[model samples]
Target: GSNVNHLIKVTDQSITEGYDDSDGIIKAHDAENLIYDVTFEVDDKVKSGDTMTVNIDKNTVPSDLTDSFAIPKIKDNSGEIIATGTYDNTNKQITYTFTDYVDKYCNIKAHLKLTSYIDKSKVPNNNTKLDVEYKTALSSVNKTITVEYQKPNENRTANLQSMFTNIDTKNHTVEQTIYINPLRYSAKETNVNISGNGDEGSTIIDDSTIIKVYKVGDNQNLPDSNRIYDYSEYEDVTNDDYAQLGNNNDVNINFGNIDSPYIIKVISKYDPNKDDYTTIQQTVTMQTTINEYTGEFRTASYDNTIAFSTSSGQGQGDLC
Candidate 1:
């Protein structure tokens, strides 16, 4: 007999979340899970080892199948294992292979399901169209979907996440870097109050203790530059934007006064459309020599805190 194929029809296609009601186009990030259900009929012409494949463009979706799963096997009308399916990430295809059980029945139908999620990096800034194909042993079916990709709006928050690094035990020194808005969202008119405390003579802070203030920029020239912040251009907060709020032998570095804080005017220069935002960072150095000694080891610790607040309409607007 000839290697004839069957007709597979896509019976269901839908998204999980982030459905935009205005334009009827789904939001890219909102597409947490994409479900596709396809059905086909099989006859005695189908032999063992025959397979049907579902194809999806690899670039349109992410490889992380955490939110989605694959249907390994499909049962026929008689509740018997007719075929099994597996997903191949390399080729972006799902292969459903028939078993010898198909030979037992002349009238057999199979329904297959596949799931995936949208990849933000792979999606373009404008509306993107995704195409999916279902290939049977003899025929093929296609489906098209539209989604809009735009960076979501972000507000300013004092996410003063700090970490200790460059621990020099021999020299009794340590450094702390406070990541202000580490996620690199938008912040306008940001006011931050930084203070440090430690045991008497256990630690020290001076002009040298304050390291360089690195400024991260949105360099649109490189690929996937939105995730890259290490290649930050230069330093900033030099003249009026920076101020020494109050200090009394204690480490007190304030950006702007509580009443009249400094304004980070750099946000106006960068384009939020390109996923760009300016961030001001501070690195502080401290001497770690203390009174607590266990055997031949001496241990000391220091505490740092920050108070931050900001205004709205900083980085991204509501289509305004």
Candidate 2:
């Protein structure tokens, strides 16, 4: 019997907080307390009762910063505080646990205050330099600070109590369908597959995988180009197929086998200016499983998934 039940693993996740580049303010300071808001996006599929615990470590802070008070407060868009926790300066960390009920989303805001006074004899009587670069040196001044969340070993799974069983069942199939959107530029060639381990230094992509490409762009009169490229030929997949995929209508690629894990890659070449050619590649992995109940002709299930794309490093040749 096939089972739609799956224990999807999500690990190696981290969150970091810093000053907003545009405003040049690390923490918003008023007459009262300096404050900063930390926002996170949890997958909507995360069901009710699933717990999300945030462990925040003060990575850096301003020196001589005393009273350095900070508190974690969760709120909604309506300006209501749902949860709050005081920071533990002794351990330089704080943990906030989210439980109770399910909500569409939540916001975490940390309010911090600096209580250290500067000595009048230490420097100029009226120094504006200290205030000018305050944000930049906050983390180092014992006044500046940042909190970082450690990557989770595994995804916080939804509690069984929160699982919704009222959803309707869908069909099942072995063929996995994948679609690629190259954004403003057309992809010269595209590959769809997966590769990567848990380590930071591991190979980005272990092997070349087969994927199809279609060409579609601003030019409507242009003929549609579509083709499949096996990993064996790099140039064809990189150049010819990429051009074909981008010049025509949107491309749709299908993989018949669904039981195994695979990665998808797309290499695209486009010229913003005449005679200027550049290539960009994107990759995604796809995994499929059977739906529950398999004795008879039953509903099939499939999901065309994406993980993350690797960096292209540098452009080939002079095409920057």
Per-residue lDDT over 1-320 for candidate 2, one digit per residue giving the tens place of the 0 to 100 score: 11101211222222222223413222211111122222333333333344333322233222211233344344444554433434454443333333232244433222222222221112212211233111110121213322111111111110000000011112111111122321222211222232222112111221222333333324312101111223333222223332212222223333332222222233222122333211111223222222235412111111211111111001011111
Question: RMSD, model 1, all Cα superposed?
Answer: 18.2
Candidates' lDDT values, in order? 0.39, 0.24
Q: Which predicted model would earn the best lDDT?
A: 1
CA-only RMSD, every prediction = 18.2, 26.4
Clashing pairs in 1: 5-138
RMSD of 2: 26.4
